[PDB]
Every structure is written in C-alpha cells, then in structure tokens.
Amino acid sequence: TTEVLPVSMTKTAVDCNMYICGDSTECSSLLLQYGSFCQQLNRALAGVS
Amino acid sequence: TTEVLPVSMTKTAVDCNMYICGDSTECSSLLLQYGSFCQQLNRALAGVSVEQDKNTQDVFAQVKSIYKVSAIKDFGGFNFSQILPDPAKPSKRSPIEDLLYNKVTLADPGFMKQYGDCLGGVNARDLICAQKFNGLTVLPPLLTDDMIAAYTSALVSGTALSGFTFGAGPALQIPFPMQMAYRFNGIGVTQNVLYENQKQIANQFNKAISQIQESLTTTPTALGKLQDVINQNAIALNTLVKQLSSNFGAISSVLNDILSRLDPPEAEVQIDRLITGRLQSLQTYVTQQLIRAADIRASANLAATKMSECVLGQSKRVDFCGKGYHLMSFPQAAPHGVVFLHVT
Amino acid sequence: NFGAISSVLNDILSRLDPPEAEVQIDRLITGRLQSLQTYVTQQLIRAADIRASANLAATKMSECVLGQSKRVDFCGKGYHLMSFPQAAPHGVVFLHVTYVPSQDKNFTTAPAICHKGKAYFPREGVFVTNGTHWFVTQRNFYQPEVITTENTFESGNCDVVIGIVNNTVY
Amino acid sequence: PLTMLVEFSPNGTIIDAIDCSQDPLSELKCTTKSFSVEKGIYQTSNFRVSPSLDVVRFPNMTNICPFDQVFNKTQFPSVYAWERVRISDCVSDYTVLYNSSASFSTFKCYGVSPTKLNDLCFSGVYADYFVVKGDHVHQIAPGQTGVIADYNYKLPSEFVGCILAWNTRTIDSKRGFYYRLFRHGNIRPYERDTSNVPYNAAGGTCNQPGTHNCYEPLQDYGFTSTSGVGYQPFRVVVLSFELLNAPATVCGPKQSTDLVKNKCVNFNFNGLTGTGVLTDSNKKFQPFQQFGRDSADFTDSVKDPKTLEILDITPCSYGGVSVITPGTNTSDSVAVLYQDVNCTDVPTMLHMDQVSNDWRVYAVNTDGNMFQTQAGCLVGATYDNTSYECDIPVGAGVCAKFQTTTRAKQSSILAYTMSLGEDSNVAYSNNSIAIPTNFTISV
Ligand SMILES: *[C@@H]1O[C@H](CO)[C@@H](O[C@@H]2O[C@H](CO)[C@@H](O[C@@H]3O[C@H](CO)[C@@H](O)[C@H](O[C@H]4O[C@H](CO)[C@@H](O)[C@H](O)[C@@H]4O)[C@@H]3O)[C@H](O)[C@H]2NC(C)=O)[C@H](O)[C@H]1NC(C)=O
Ligand SMILES: *[C@@H]1O[C@H](CO)[C@@H](O[C@@H]2O[C@H](CO)[C@@H](O[C@@H]3O[C@H](CO)[C@@H](O)[C@H](O)[C@@H]3O)[C@H](O)[C@H]2NC(C)=O)[C@H](O)[C@H]1NC(C)=O
Ligand SMILES: *[C@@H]1O[C@H](CO)[C@@H](O[C@@H]2O[C@H](CO)[C@@H](O[C@@H]3O[C@H](CO)[C@@H](O)[C@H](O)[C@@H]3O)[C@H](O)[C@H]2NC(C)=O)[C@H](O)[C@H]1NC(C)=O
Ligand SMILES: *[C@@H]1O[C@H](CO)[C@@H](O[C@@H]2O[C@H](CO)[C@@H](O)[C@H](O)[C@H]2NC(C)=O)[C@H](O)[C@H]1NC(C)=O
Ligand SMILES: *[C@@H]1O[C@H](CO)[C@@H](O[C@@H]2O[C@H](CO)[C@@H](O)[C@H](O)[C@H]2NC(C)=O)[C@H](O)[C@H]1NC(C)=O
Ligand SMILES: *[C@@H]1O[C@H](CO)[C@@H](O[C@@H]2O[C@H](CO)[C@@H](O)[C@H](O)[C@H]2NC(C)=O)[C@H](O)[C@H]1NC(C)=O
Ligand SMILES: CCCCC/C=C/C/C=C/CCCCCCCC(=O)O
Ligand SMILES: *[C@@H]1O[C@H](CO)[C@@H](O)[C@H](O)[C@H]1NC(C)=O
Ligand SMILES: *[C@@H]1O[C@H](CO)[C@@H](O)[C@H](O)[C@H]1NC(C)=O
Ligand SMILES: *[C@@H]1O[C@H](CO)[C@@H](O)[C@H](O)[C@H]1NC(C)=O
Ligand SMILES: *[C@@H]1O[C@H](CO)[C@@H](O)[C@H](O)[C@H]1NC(C)=O
C-alpha cells in the first residue's frame, strides 16, 4: 500500500523597496517614515525559508 | 542522552488607549468611532495568556502524590545525587537544574519588582520603563520555579521507589536492582546478565551522568531552543515601542503638536493617519503572537506525551525515548521548558 | 464611522457630489475590508487547532477502539482493555475500560534460588516466600506457583550475586 | 464632567446607567461593557483620576511687537527689490491692529490655523514686504505661476507662515514702482535680482535698449489717481515662522500660573501641552535645548522658562491594576491587585487625594485586608495559612475563593497558597515487595 506526504515548500524572498516604490527617490524617502514594516516583513519570510 | 523541549512563553498584556492615544481626551473620543477593534485585541491576548499555564500543568502536574527519598542512600551502586534535590544545602533544586538555570539569560525580572524604579532611576532610558509608560505589561506565571522543581523531585523519587507503578495506580515498592532486571526483560535480554554484571552497569551509569555536567558547563549552546523563545519575545515587544516614533505620513509623530497648531476640522484628518498606523502595528503584533502560541502548543503536547510514555513507562517505540533500546528517563526543569535524560 | 460623516453610505451620496463623496466612501471601504480580513485570519488559525484535535481523535479511534494499546496514558488511567465511541455535537466521546490493581500485601523476596551449586533466576516474574517455602509469581496478580523447570532459567554458580538464598528447586 | 455606561430598552427607553469613577466594581463594568460580570480576574483601564487644575508658564517679557513700525511707518519698496526684516523678543498681541488704517483685504495662512496664533511660541520670525498691483495679489502664494511668481518673488513649496495684503490708493499713487518683465529662466525660492542690464530676445547681450530685439527689462506700474480697482497699488507682507528646539523669541499673550508638583494636571510650557505628573529631575540638557524625548517620542523632560530648572513628566496611570470578582450573581465584593508595587507606596501611586471616597478604602491597611505577594500588593482579601485547590488564579502561587463570613472585621474573599497534592509515606526497602491481590474495572 502507498502513502504520500508533503514535507517542504518553495522558499521565496521579497524586496520591500522594489515592490512598493520601484525605482524612485521620492517614494523611497517617503517609505522611511512608515517605520520597520518591512525590516520585520523580511525576518518572517527568512525564518519560513 | 539529553532532549530539550520548550513548554511556555511569556504572558503579555496591552492597554489600547494608553498605546494609541496616551493621555489625550480628544484622541480617545475619536477612537470610540473605530469600533470594537480593542475589546477584540484584548480577548486574543488573554486566551494566549491563559493557555500558557495549562501548558505547564499538562506537563508537570500529572501525579498528585509527593514522594520523598534521601539522596545519599545506596540503591545498589547507583548514585542518584546529581538528579535529586540536595539534602542540607539551602537550594530546593538539584545539581543539574542549578546549572541549567545559569545558562539562559532571562530578559529583565521586573524593575519595580527588582529594586527598580522608572522614576529618576530610569537610567539613560530602560527598555522596560518605555514599555510600561506605553501600555505593555508582562504577567508572572502561576507556578513558581521552586514549585515546579517540587514536581520533578517527586517524579524521580517515585521511580526509585516503585518503578512505573505510580502511573497506573498506587505505588508498589520494589528493590531497585529488581526493577532494573524487569527493564532488561523488556528489551529482550534475560534477567541474569544484570545480576552478573551489576557492578559495571552501576559504573557506566554513574560515569555517564557525571559527564552531562561537564558537557553543559563548558559548551554554551545546545540549550538553543529555550533561548530563542526569550529572544523572539524581547525583539517583538521592543519593535512595538519603537514604532510609536513614526509619522505614517502626517505632520508629526506627536499628537500634542498637531492639536497645538491645527483647529478641530483639519486636526482630525491628521489624527486619523496616526490612529490607523498604530492600530495596524498592534494588529500585526497579536496575529504573530497567536501563530507562535500554536507552535508552542504542539511542543507542549509532545513533552506531555513523552512524560507519560518515557518516564511513567518503558516504550517500545524506536526513536522516541533516545537512540537505542530504552530503559529509563528522568525529567529536569529548565526555564520555559523541560530536559529529558534518556538511558539506553 | 471610521472617521467619515456617517456609517450609512446613502447619507453621503444624498448630501455630497461625485468628487467629495469618494473621499468619504473610501474611508468606509478601507475599514470594512479590514474587519473582514481580521475575521478570516482568526478563522484560519482556529481551523488549524481543530485539525490537530481531529487528527488525535482519528488516531485514538484506530488505536484505542479497533485495538488494545500498550502506551500507558493514551486510553485512560490504568491498563487498557476496551473503548467505545459515542457521537456528540461537533465532537466525539470515548468510554475507556481499564484494569486497576487494589488491595496490596507485602512479601519477602530474593533475586535467585540456589540448588546443587547451580543458580536459578526467574524467566518472567518474582520469587516470593510465606516462610520456609518459595514460589514464583506474576507481578500484577498474586498467584504463587511451584518452582520447576519451565518457569525457571538456570545459569551459573552460587556466588557473586548478592541476596542469593538457598532452597529446593524441584 | 464624567463618563457613564448606559443601557437602553428594546423600545428605546433608558433603563440603566452607572458612573465609572465611583468604585472598582463600576470600573470593571465600564471596562467590560456589561452590567453583569462572571467569575475571575480582569485588567481594567483608568477611570479613577482626572486632572483638575491647569499649569501654564511662559517667558517673562512684556513689550509688544513692532506692528506700527512695519505697517504704518516704513516707506515700501518695489517688488524686484524686496526687503526682509527680523522680529525678536516681543509679545505678539495683534489686536492692536484693529485700531489702525490697514483695512486688510487678503489674510490667508499655510501651516497655521488663525485661531491658535494666540497660544503659540515661535523660534524665529521673518517679515518680507513690498508693493504690487491689484491683479497681481493672487500670485503671492506657494505653487503659482505668472510674471511675479517667476521673475520677481517666489515662495517655497513647504511654506509655513501667513500672508497679508491691503490697498494703499491714497499714499502710493505715484511713479517709481517697477517690476521685472523679461528674464532668461525662473528664479529660485527666496531669491532677488536687482540687475538692470539690457535684454536681448535672441539670447545674448546688447549695448543700447530700443533697437531691434533689445528691450528694457523693467516696467513701471504707472499708478494714477483715476485707475481701476485692478490697477491700484497694494502693500503686501509675508511672515515666515520657525518651530524648533530653541529658545522662544516671539510668544502670544498668555497669563502664567503657579508650579503645582506631584499631581495629575494639564500643563502648557511655551506652547508644549500635555497631561501628567511633574517632578524634579536629575537630567542634564545642552545650553539651547528646551525638552527631551525618549525612544517612543514621549516627552519626558522640560525646562521652566522662568526658574530655568529641568523637570520630569510621568503619566497619571503607569502600572496595571487588576480586579478579582466571584460573580455579580453571588456578591458585590471585589479585591484589587496592584502589579509590581510594594504596599508602602500604594497611596502615592493611586493619587489618594484625588480619587473618590470609596476608592480610599482600597489603599489603607485597616484590619488586615492588605498583604503582599510576589505579583504585587493585594487589598480586600484575608490570607489563610492553610492550602486548598486553586479556584481563581491570582499569580505567583496565590489563588482566591469565596467565603461566607461570621467574625466581623474580616473580609469575604479568601486568598491562599495553592496545594500541590497529598504527601505519601512509602519508604524504600531492599528485601520486600508489594503485590496486588484484587482489582477494579473502571470506566
Ligand atoms: C545663476 O547664474 C547663472 C550664470 O549667469 C545663470 O546661468 C545662465 O542661465 C541662463 C538661463 O538659462 C542661460 O541663458 C540662455 O542661454 C542660451 C544660449 O543659447 C539662450 O539661447 C537663452 O535664451 C533663450 O531663451 C529666451 C527666452 O527667455 C529666448 O528669447 C532666446 O531666443 C533663447 O531661446 C538663454 O539666454 C545662460 O547661458 C546661463 N549661463 C551660464 C550657464 O553660464 C543661472 O540661470 C542663474 N540662475 C538663476 C536661477 O538666476
Ligand atoms: C488707537 O489709536 C489711537 C491713536 O494712535 C491711540 O491713541 C494714543 O494712545 C496712546 C496711549 O494712551 C497715547 O499715548 C499717551 O500720550 C500722552 C501724551 O500725548 C501721554 O501723556 C500718555 O501718558 C500716553 O503716553 C497717545 O497720545 C494717543 N494718541 C492719540 C492721537 O490719541 C489709542 O491708544 C489706540 N487704541 C488704544 C485703545 O490703545
Ligand atoms: C543703483 O543706484 C543708482 C543710483 O541710485 C540707480 O540709478 C538710478 O536709476 C534710475 C532707473 O532705475 C534712474 O531713473 C531714470 O533717470 C533718467 C534720468 O537720469 C530718466 O530719464 C528715466 O526716466 C528714469 O527716471 C535714476 O535717474 C538713477 N539715478 C542715479 C543717481 O543714477 C540705479 O538704478 C541703481 N541700480 C540698481 C537697480 O541696482
Ligand atoms: C556520588 O557522586 C558524588 C559526586 O561525584 C561523590 O562525591 C564527591 O562529590 C564531589 C563534588 O560534589 C567531587 O568533587 C568528589 O570527587 C566526589 N567524591 C567521590 C569519591 O566521587 C560521591 O562520593 C558519590 N558517592 C555516592 C554518595 O554514592
Ligand atoms: C507455605 O506454603 C506451603 C505450600 O502451600 C504450605 O504447605 C502446605 O500447607 C497446607 C496447609 O497447612 C498443608 O495441607 C500441605 O500439606 C502443606 N504442604 C507443603 C508442600 O508444605 C505451608 O503451610 C505455608 N506456610 C505458611 C506459614 O503458611
Ligand atoms: C522671571 O521673573 C521672576 C519674578 O521677578 C524672577 O524671579 C526672581 O528671581 C530672583 C533671582 O533668581 C529671585 O531672587 C527672586 O526671589 C525671584 N522671584 C520670584 C517671585 O520667584 C525670575 O528669575 C525671572 N526669570 C528670568 C529667566 O529672568
Ligand atoms: C510687525 C510684527 C510682526 C509680528 C508677527 C507675529 C505674530 C504672529 C501672527 C500674527 C500676525 C497676523 C495678524 C492678523 C490680524 C488679523 C487679520 C485680519 O484682520 O484679517
Ligand atoms: C519593595 O520592598 C522590598 C523589600 O523591602 C525591597 O527590596 C524593594 O526594593 C522594594 N521596592 C520598592 C517598590 O520600593
Ligand atoms: C539490605 O539492607 C540491610 C540493612 O542495611 C543489610 O543488612 C542487607 O545486607 C541488605 N541486603 C541487600 C541484599 O542489600
Ligand atoms: C418601553 O419599555 C419600558 C420597559 O418595559 C416600559 O416601561 C415603557 O412603558 C415602554 N414604552 C413603550 C412606549 O413601549
Ligand atoms: C475482590 O473484592 C470484592 C469486593 O470486596 C470481593 O467481593 C471479592 O471477593 C474480592 N475478590 C478477591 C479476588 O479477593
């Protein structure tokens, strides 16, 4: 008899600045005043990986 | 062989008004119009806090009898001195738990509870003080360390008196070498090989337990699943405080500087951009805590089942109570967790 | 309100014109989407906790009810005999039947019994005595049997071992 | 002024109401938002203490700012050659402008509300002044175009300050007012160009105006006594403001009060407003620093502008309070836990002299209803030296339960230490064994 079980998922990474603001100095300088919302969004995905 | 398993994490509590609006009647009045986000953010945190005590109760308190045995007794060649509480020395813990409690760097025991004061004695600026000034509190556990260490002394002295009969009914006394001959019969080996080489089994056993000490007192790691529990709580509670310093797109991050220069109609468009960011930060904090609690509960359940099948029984499952054929196991208390010593 | 002038979308579209109404509708859409998001993410987390208990119940129904288990505290407190399932709203209730010893009495014991120089150790059980009479019995129920050649294993000489006593090994 | 919890009927009549600042039970009801509470221990918000008086302190100066000199006295310049002056060390009581002949037609401000100008203190003020015509007044604003906003006077996009304009037909209807009309490129914000060189429309220079493709760069307004309303002269003043961590130089007309210390109050230091408790400080500031902020941007220190001493600000409710109840269907008695607080400094933490009479009962020892645990100080319960099984978890090995009382001077909620189980008297033996004789079938 056969039994199948998953063990792992594909691991991904995101760039906060590239996704949110593209390549733009004004958007980047405006994203610094929203805090650590994507410094903290990187550790989670790194731990999952 | 050793095995480390976490059982609980720190209990936290949040005051919504103090975190979002501080002491500002105006802001408070406005928060009322965003609804029950705050009587809903407190119930989740309260459930997480009440689960952490049941986690410990399901692992340590499953025998309601306190058995006592002197540690300097003979037992047929087995020492049992580095695992049972010292007799005279003040400590109510054992020689191994005392070493385990000196290898985890807990994060603050409570300023105003440790000769501390967030007034004048705030130092340059104690993290703890900034938390209390902003609505974040840490609650103490229900079971004390001296009182957790009492359950483990009654669980090791119950297997030096009765074997694993205390876990199916009343304790039935048996001589210790007669108990170790019953356990050799359980892995397929006849009873004579223990009676004929008792003095070398009582020396290999004695040397193995005397070498766990000097493999922990030198190596700093391998207690590395209990330290991360403390570190993740600390860096997640400190990230919430440092986020009240962001302007989220308004003229300032302080609310008493938007109300000292703008009038009731235009101040409300700027005090909505801050009430919206500070609600999102809190929501993120609690949704990450709810996920971490679910991972701690699986390990607590696994520790509870190992305390029943490896300590109050002999297991025939292969790699469940060590690497080899299982004979005995001993529990030892560790901060936020438990350490199992497996004999094989 | 979420900051807007009312919570009723049809009191904003009756008093305000296309340009300045979309500045007040957006502030309701944003909050009403956040509430749904919170509800869904708290429901997904609860589903995970229900799944673990359902898996435990499925394991316990195959092991505790369609078999007899030797793991100690899995089908009740004691030595497991049988289990019966019963249906309950959104759940299941197991009735576990267990064997619990009672009325213990103390006896004097010995590791081996010496006869004609050779040493006789028990195959499975303990040696007990009433007084100048030696038997072998099982540990879960007192049933003394007479010493003989299939419930006793012979191997060695009558020395070295400590506590050895001498008696007939019929 | 107080806050209450109100419960309505299904038809729409008021059937119940409670005051939240009266007693701990009412505080628990208001926090939970219900009139009936189940058994257990809860964490409550603050409805106890509210501020009563106000502390406002401003600098010592009294002399009024020079409104006459800059509005009725100076002769005003042209727009290309505009002038700037500095204002320092004066009180900005602008009501003295109502008795003058200015008659303002345009008064409009950015980064400031007109109704707060009397409660603000500024670190720096600049005043620019000049003359334009009637149709050019609307060009003096951030983000505009035209001839004046491009070649003469330009405001930065992030401007903070006010703009004033008024008609001066009877004093300025003469020749000699010019504006620049031709220029290569635009000027940058707060810049001046006073050159009077001939302009060549192809891109170079000249040596004499009036010939082909060479013009004078400045044009006269040509004010006369019979012009239309759009060709009249108008005087314009622009005031620019700075708000930083620096000594105040211009402040509004406010009256100062006395320093009240060690009480939950509302305060105003040089326009910095708040609520809390003010105490003495052992911190050190730099010579031109006015306040200090911590990692959460909470202002924790401030200096007095009169006595020059540094004081500290602490919130009015800093530690958590918890309330223990056995249920409103059973009794109305409650107990109070003050977390991480020693029983000797409870009165100075709750602000006894500022709470209701019923609340001071839970802050004094009286007949042994105040005792100390490792989680905090607990008031309203009697300690028992025997141990039971836990009912309501208080913490650190302490639990609580309900008791019906007889002896008076004795509370109705019992606190105790939790019991771990019953002791056993099984002793070790090296030659004896216990074997069961009967059994039991359990379900
Ligand atoms: C600060 O000072 C510097 C140095 O003086 C100054 O730089 C100069 O800026 C001007 C304006 O951009 C430049 O002038 C141009 O030069 C070309 C040369 O071919 C001319 O064609 C341009 O004139 C054109 O535009 C006119 C309309 O206004 C047309 O009528 C005409 O036919 C042309 O199309 C124009 O004169 C000049 O070359 C530089 N000089 C340098 C770089 O040395 C700078 O602008 C000053 N900044 C400010 C804000 O004052
Ligand atoms: C409204 O405008 C009028 C005119 O500018 C103001 O009248 C002026 O008021 C001041 C202050 O009282 C007078 O100063 C006084 O001068 C006399 C000598 O002339 C002196 O003896 C006093 O001690 C004082 O210094 C000033 O003379 C007077 N001028 C006129 C023309 O009346 C008026 O004060 C303004 N409004 C208010 C209510 O301030
Ligand atoms: C620098 O300073 C000198 C002296 O103040 C300024 O010179 C003055 O310039 C104006 C034109 O801007 C002259 O007005 C003109 O005078 C002539 C007759 O001389 C007349 O025909 C014109 O219609 C016009 O009225 C003024 O006479 C002249 N005065 C002197 C003493 O030179 C010069 O403009 C200044 N330069 C700048 C703008 O920095
Ligand atoms: C049981 O083990 C202890 C610890 O090894 C023995 O006692 C001494 O313990 C100290 C440390 O507490 C060591 O420095 C000594 O070397 C130990 N001495 C010996 C002879 O090992 C103890 O003697 C052992 N014996 C028992 C009580 O069974
Ligand atoms: C110990 O056990 C033996 C075996 O059961 C007992 O011996 C028998 O006792 C019965 C009752 O007195 C006699 O009828 C038998 O003839 C005995 N036979 C043997 C083999 O001895 C003995 O009495 C028991 N002793 C005690 C102290 O109870
Ligand atoms: C502001 O004015 C007050 C009142 O005149 C000044 O206070 C006096 O200061 C002197 C010198 O220190 C003391 O001898 C007096 O006793 C103070 N009087 C009172 C009533 O406090 C104060 O010094 C002035 N502040 C500044 C910055 O000049
Ligand atoms: C010459 C001294 C300048 C000092 C400026 C400092 C004060 C700050 C603000 C006040 C100036 C504006 C007054 C407006 C008066 C009302 C205008 C109107 O009638 O519509
Ligand atoms: C509380 O009392 C204890 C014991 O006297 C003392 O060590 C501690 O410093 C005190 N803390 C406070 C709050 O003053
Ligand atoms: C049992 O203990 C007694 C008393 O210490 C001793 O005399 C006897 O030799 C011991 N016997 C064994 C087998 O340990
Ligand atoms: C509303 O209900 C209340 C409580 O029953 C009652 O006293 C009152 O008369 C009712 N009024 C109406 C109009 O129904
Ligand atoms: C077991 O106990 C029951 C109840 O006392 C009694 O009726 C029965 O005879 C006993 N049987 C044995 C094996 O002693």
What is the CB-side half-sphere exposure of residue D94 using CA atoms within 13 A? 14
Q: How far apart are CA D139 and CA B209, in angstroms?
A: 89
Tell me which residue of D374, D75, B318, D34 sits closest to B310, measured CA to CA.
B318
- B305 contacts chain A (CB < 8 A): no
- Decide whether any atom of ligand 9 lies within 6 Å of the D430 Cβ: yes
Q: Do chains A and C touch (3 or more CB pairs under 8 A)?
A: no
**Residue whose CA is at the smallest distance from ligand 3 atom 11:** D196
Sign of the Cα pseudo-torsion (C71, C74, C75, C79, in order):
positive
3-state secondary structure of A31: helix
* Ligand number, closest to the Cα atom of D12: 10
DSSP label at residue D150: H
Do residues B33 and B278 make contact, with C-beta atoms less than 8 angstroms apart? Answer: no
Using CB atoms, which residue from A30, A34, A40 is nearest to B239?
A: A40
- The experimental resolution of this structure, in angstroms, equals 2.2
The b/e string for D386-404 (b: 16+ C-beta within 10 A; e otherwise) is eeeebebbbbbbbbbbbee
Do residues D383 and D397 make contact, with C-beta atoms less than 8 angstroms apart? Answer: no
| Ligand 5 mean position, distance from CA B191 (Å) | 29
Q: Do chains D and B touch (3 or more CB pairs under 8 A)?
A: yes
* Ligand number, closest to the Cα atom of D80: 3
Helix C18-60 vs helix B264-306: crossing angle, to nearest 10: 10
DSSP label at residue C6: -
Using CB atoms, which residue from A34, A40, A44 is nearest to B246?
A: A34
Q: How far apart are CA A33 and CA D184, in angstroms?
A: 39
| Ligand 7 mean position, distance from CA D225 (Å) | 29
Q: What are the residues whose beta carbons fall under 8 Å from the beta carbon of A44, sequence distance 6 or more?
A: B288
Tell me which residue of B342, B2, B333 sits closest to B151, measured CA to CA.
B333
Amino acid, res. D32: T
**Residue whose CA is at the smallest distance from ligand 8 atom 2:** D342
What is the CB-side half-sphere exposure of residue D52 using CA atoms within 13 A? 9
Experimental approach was cryo-EM
DSSP label at residue D175: S
Out of D428, D429, D431, D432, mutate this one to test ligand 9's pocket (max ligand atoms within 8 Å of CB): namely D431
Q: What are the residues whose beta carbons fall under 8 Å from the beta carbon of C36, sequence distance 6 or more?
A: none
* Partners of residue C96 in chain D, C-beta under 8 Å: 443
Q: How far apart are CA D370 and CA D336, in angstroms?
A: 10
What tokens were used for B278? 């500070």
What tokens were used for B265? 């109609």
The secondary structure of chain B, three-state, reads CEEEEECCCCEEEECHHHHHCCCCHHHHHHHHHHCCHHHHHHHHHHHHHHHHHHHHHHHHCCCCEECCCCCCCCCCCCCCCCCCCCCCCCCCCCCCHHHHCCCCCCCCCCHHHCCCCCCCCCCCCCHHHHHHCCCEEEECCCCCHHHHHHHHHHHHCCCCCCCCCCCCCCCCCCCHHHHHHHHHHHHCCCCHHHHHCHHHHHHHHHHHHCCCHHHHCCCCCCCCCCHHHHHHHHHHHHHHHCCCCCCCCCCCCCCCCCCCCCCHHHHHHHHHHHHHHHHHHHHHHHHHHHHHHHHHHHHHHHHHHHHHHHHCCCCCCCCCCCCCCCCEEEEEEECCEEEEEEEC
Q: How far apart are CA B142 and CA D374, in angstroms?
A: 11
Task: Name the helix (H) or strand (E) containing C96.
Answer: strand C91-110
* Partners of residue D434 in chain C, C-beta under 8 Å: 104-107
* Partners of residue C106 in chain B, C-beta under 8 Å: 173
Do residues B152 and B139 make contact, with C-beta atoms less than 8 angstroms apart? Answer: no
Using CB atoms, which residue from D113, D271, D420 is nearest to B66?
A: D420
- D432 contacts chain C (CB < 8 A): yes
- Are B195 and C45 inside 8 Å of each other by CB? no
